[PDB]
Amino acid sequence: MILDTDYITEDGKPVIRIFKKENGEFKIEYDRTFEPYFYALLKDDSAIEEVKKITAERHGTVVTVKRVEKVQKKFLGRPVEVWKLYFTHPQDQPAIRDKIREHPAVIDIYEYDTPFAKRYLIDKGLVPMEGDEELKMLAFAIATLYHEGEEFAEGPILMISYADEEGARVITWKNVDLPYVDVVSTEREMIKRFLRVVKEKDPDVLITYNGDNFDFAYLKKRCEKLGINFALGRDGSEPKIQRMGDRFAVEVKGRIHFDLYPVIRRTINLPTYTLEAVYEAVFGQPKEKVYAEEITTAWETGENLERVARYSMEDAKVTYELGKEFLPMEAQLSRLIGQSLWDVSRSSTGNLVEWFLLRKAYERNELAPNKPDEKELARRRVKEPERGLWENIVYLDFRSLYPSIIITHNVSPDTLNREGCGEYDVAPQVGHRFCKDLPGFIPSLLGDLLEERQKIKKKMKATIDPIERKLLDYRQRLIKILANSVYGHMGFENARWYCKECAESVTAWGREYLTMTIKEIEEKYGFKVIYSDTDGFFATIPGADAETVKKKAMEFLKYINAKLPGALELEYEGFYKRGFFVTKKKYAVIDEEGKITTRGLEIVRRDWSEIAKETQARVLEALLKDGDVEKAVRIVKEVTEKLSKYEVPPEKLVIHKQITRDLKDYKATGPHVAVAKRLAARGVKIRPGTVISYIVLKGSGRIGDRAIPFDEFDPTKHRYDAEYYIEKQVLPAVERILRAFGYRKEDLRYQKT
Ligand SMILES: [Mg+2]
Ligand SMILES: [Mg+2]
Ligand SMILES: [Mg+2]
Ligand SMILES: [Mg+2]
Ligand SMILES: [Mg+2]
Ligand SMILES: [Mg+2]
Ligand SMILES: [Mg+2]
Ligand SMILES: [Mg+2]
Ligand SMILES: [Mg+2]
Ligand code: NA
Ligand code: NA
């Protein structure tokens, strides 16, 4: 299995290394035969002799064109003749490329800035992370001595924790008497011991959380300070930093440094990306945070070091588990995109699409178009649903609408307005013509992807190993997203295969096929379409029973799919006993077993009191389970009355809100801050991350001066602000739903007093 590739320089020539793990053993294969190159299109072939003599200087040495070769490749759908320019070293290209381009005889150059080791994987047809090999992983974390107003890593590393399948352990240089703690004399011995642990376990993957920007940088400075050869690379190298645009990344040669931070940042939306928040999100269970001042205070006083050690062990432990959780998906991605997990784990959707497409282009001998220049980048810059309760609803939607359009109409930059074609398809509204005589670059590669996905689904059934099936499932699911990412690519201003006409033709066709499908089902099968969005719609036959609606649905799908051209296909996605539709993106349905599914409506954040969430839930089931609007309305009115009668348990009024800044550097951004400041004033430790839990009390002033921490609420003396909970919690939770039935907030309570 291929893990990574790079190059070293040997007598001024590149030596590709391919890092592999085969039959449970690490191996480095060398290849000295591969040569840097890019392409030039010239006005007069004759000028090649001048172009061959162009030179530049890198460092203090002369850079020349090593050799040239006339080649034939596809550009804009047609065979073209271009000159392949070879160079001695990859770093020659940035030095000489602009001098070649600037030559008068040179029209343009192409494929001139692909990183050498990534070209290698492409041009040789190699794919990372392919095979049955099992990777050995090791997570690690550190805890440091922090003092505000100090330079970075001025203080020592206090603890290094690490976790793999054999458990988690902590290394530290003060005595902590715990079974999972290994005590050593000094920081230096700690670090050295950690090196021995890594070298002896020899993992293929090192997992961190934010190691790209903190852990390895800290370790680096401390190792400089202490004169330690931090030789974690399997070739004896030290971790190497790469500039990752705004910040940095770190490689450990011969291994994969999997930093979870960027992976998780893109996979899940959260307000905060602390390790504790991410571990609760993913695994559903809190993780306790020990703050930096407590760590430093513990080290200084010698007291509560066991608490520090446990936090350190847990950092490593949860980092490992998160790695176990996210890495297999990123590995399948890496295999499908054909680039290393190191690169893929840190790459935008954009970058990943381009790498896939560059490979396809190499595989089809198509000359890649160029990223736009800044002048070009500048150039590249409805229907409310039916109201009310519906019953016996079917959801029907297209299979891979945008890909399927692209395939069907052969939509591609290289097919657009092709001259002298005998057959073209014409985009609605926008009018762009796409030639059908020859399959386009994008349509052909998308057809292959959609096919492989169906082939993968076929094998998933023919398999029992649930693991193998999950890995097949990941690949299948990744292909679908890649297919849609290809569609987005055509509309993206920085894309190589940009094609604005392609993008706007695809969406135009989509609207035509959706709207036509809706027209047929209503006119020719008596359905009423309740709600539609882009690539699907809900409908019913008003007054029909569930079986009629299903049967007619299946008959319509047959009719429409026969009429639909090519790959366009509508499918039965589900049946729903009842539902309602507030607006685009906001709706609620219940299936025949009782399972409610909602979208755009449910009240989630912990900024909502339980009474709000509970009431909204009860409304939704009165609407969906009972089809009873008046009952939903009675529930609300009854809740708001109970509030006013001080009958709602105080535990259902509690609002929780996290402190984000120093209570000094705040925004007067709510009652949670006022409570925080009073606590601070009494001498309570408030930090970013402190959760404040409060109840709002009746009286005058902003809620702020009136709210109090839940643990101080005593019903025998305190009266909560029934009005606040009615008007600012309960009613806002239900108003959007019940507006869809003609009710305004004031219609859902008794009159104020
Ligand atoms: Mg750490
Ligand atoms: Mg080793
Ligand atoms: Mg770092
Ligand atoms: Mg090296
Ligand atoms: Mg990473
Ligand atoms: Mg895969
Ligand atoms: Mg690739
Ligand atoms: Mg579908
Ligand atoms: Mg309630
Ligand atoms: Na390939
Ligand atoms: Na024809």
Q: By what method was this entry solved? A: X-ray
Quote the CA–CA distance of 73 and 55 in Å, as a whole number.
Answer: 26
Distance of CA 335 from the midpoint of ligand 10 (Å): 10
Whether 429 and 508 have beta carbons less than 8 Å apart is answered as: yes
Distance of CA 365 from the midpoint of ligand 10 (Å): 12
Tokens of 189: 């011995």
Ligand nearest to the CA of 256: 5
Amino acid at 425: D
Which option is the CATH number for 390-590: 3.90.1600.10, 3.30.2350.10, 3.40.50.300, 3.20.20.70? 3.90.1600.10
Distance of CA 348 from the midpoint of ligand 10 (Å): 21
Distance of CA 644 from the midpoint of ligand 4 (Å): 72
State which residues have CB under 5 angstroms from ligand 2, the bound ion.
199, 202
**HSE-up (13 A, CA, CB side) for residue 9:** 8
Q: Starting from the edge strand earliest in sequence, which strands make up the sheet with 25-31, in order?
A: 2-10, 13-22, 25-31
State which residues have CB under 5 angstroms from ligand 5, the bound ion.
258-259, 345
Q: Are strands 167-172 and 181-183 parallel, antiparallel or unpaired?
A: parallel
**HSE-up (13 A, CA, CB side) for residue 131:** 15
Distance of CA 539 from the midpoint of ligand 10 (Å): 44
Q: Name the β-bridge partners of 695.
A: 708
Nearest to 62 by CA among 54, 70, 51, 50: 54
Whether 344 and 258 have beta carbons less than 8 Å apart is answered as: no
Tokens of 480: 């679908």
Nearest to 493 by CA among 610, 373, 412, 382: 373
Burial level of 199, CB count in 10 A (0-12/13-18/19+)? exposed
Which residues, in sequence order, are CB contacts of 377 under 8 Å at separation 6+?
Answer: 493, 494
Nearest to 538 by CA among 557, 510, 518, 552: 518
Q: How far is CA 6 from CA 14, 92, 119, 164, in A?
A: 10, 17, 11, 27
Which option is the CATH number for 34-123: 3.40.190.10, 3.20.20.150, 3.30.1360.200, 3.30.342.10? 3.30.342.10
Distance of CA 662 from the midpoint of ligand 1 (Å): 23
Quote the CA–CA distance of 714 and 711 in Å, as a whole number.
Answer: 8
DSSP string, 349-393: HHHHHHHHHHHHHHHHTBPPPPPPPHHHHHHT---PPPPS-EEEE
Ligand nearest to the CA of 127: 10
Quote the CA–CA distance of 366 and 541 in Å, as a whole number.
Answer: 51
Residue 660 Cα to chain centre, angstroms: 24
Ligand nearest to the CA of 117: 7
Ligand nearest to the CA of 534: 8
Distance of CA 665 from the midpoint of ligand 2 (Å): 47
Amino acid at 67: R
Ligand nearest to the CA of 213: 3
Longest dimension (CA), the chain: 98
Distance of CA 419 from the midpoint of ligand 11 (Å): 14
Distance of CA 613 from the midpoint of ligand 6 (Å): 40
Distance of CA 172 from the midpoint of ligand 2 (Å): 22
Distance of CA 289 from the midpoint of ligand 10 (Å): 46
Which residues, in sequence order, are CB contacts of 281 under 8 Å at separation 6+?
Answer: 268, 270
Calculate Rg over the CA atoms of the chain: 32
CATH homologous superfamily of domain 137-337? Ribonuclease H-like superfamily/Ribonuclease H (3.30.420.10)
Whether 688 and 625 have beta carbons less than 8 Å apart is answered as: no
- Bin 744: left if φ > 0, else alpha if -120 < ψ < 50, else beta: beta
Distance of CA 443 from the midpoint of ligand 10 (Å): 18
Which residue is listed with tokens 């109409």? 409
Which residues, in sequence order, are CB contacts of 201 under 8 Å at separation 6+?
Answer: 136, 138, 164
Which residues, in sequence order, are CB contacts of 174 under 8 Å at separation 6+?
Answer: 158, 183, 299, 302, 305
Which option is the CATH number for 606-611+626-748: 1.10.420.10, 1.10.287.130, 2.102.10.10, 1.10.132.60? 1.10.132.60
**Secondary structure (3-state) at 37:** strand
Tokens of 25: 């053993």
Quote the CA–CA distance of 170 and 183 in Å, as a whole number.
Answer: 8
Domain boundaries, the chain: 34-123, 137-337, 390-590, 606-611+626-748
Quote the CA–CA distance of 517 and 570 in Å, as a whole number.
Answer: 9
Residue 348 Cα to chain centre, angstroms: 8
- Which run of H or of E encompasses 284? none
Nearest to 114 by CA among 5, 213, 212: 5
Distance of CA 212 from the midpoint of ligand 3 (Å): 4
Ligand nearest to the CA of 634: 9
Which residue is listed with tokens 């997992």? 207
Residues preceding chain discontinuities in the chain with C to N over 2.5 Å: 381
Quote the CA–CA distance of 103 and 55 in Å, as a whole number.
Answer: 11
Render the burial of 629-650: b for 16+ CB within 10 Å, e for the rest. beebbebbeebbeebbeeebee
**Secondary structure (3-state) at 667:** coil
Distance of CA 94 from the midpoint of ligand 3 (Å): 28
Ligand nearest to the CA of 436: 11
